[PDB]
Amino acid sequence: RLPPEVNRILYIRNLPYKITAEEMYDIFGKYGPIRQIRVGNTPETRGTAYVVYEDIFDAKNACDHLSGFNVCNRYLVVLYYNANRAFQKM
Template sequence: MSSKGSDFPIVLVKNLPYSTSSDSLFNLFSKYGNIHQIRVPDQSSSEPAPAGSCFVIYRNIEAAHQASKRINGINFEGRYLVASIYNVDKAKLSHEDFITRRDELERLKEEYGLS
């Protein structure tokens, strides 16, 4: 599957048993590619996912697509998982990227004495 530059290798997984360990999550998801991070939100966090879910961040988009396709619907520790590619709010990301680039440009102007 070809990837677009705006795709992110993040899989959102729902319907996890609350007692699932990080090790069992890693063992399940690492079958599909190199994992950068697994994020399991706690109930007090501001993550956009409820308890019983996690974000699996892969190192490349192909691994994320493979994992979301293969994991969706499997029985894991007595629960049927729901997995999909996580859609990042690109509008917010674009604004944050603009601010970062603008700040970097200002820093470079000062460094090289440009006005």
């Protein structure tokens, strides 16, 4: 039993730019094995990242346990990946 809005990929907004890849791998790997993690390296996409997990239940448990996580001095938000919302800039 899982809603269809959840997926294997999860987006993160308003992330600190000084965060390293090891801290992001430790924060994403707490709920399960993380398959891939892509951080933005653009001024128009700064503060956002995409973490794709190997399991759907592990990705749902990671998305349920990352909305409003304690980080550096910004308000980061974790949301589900959408095809129509990610390509809104094009």
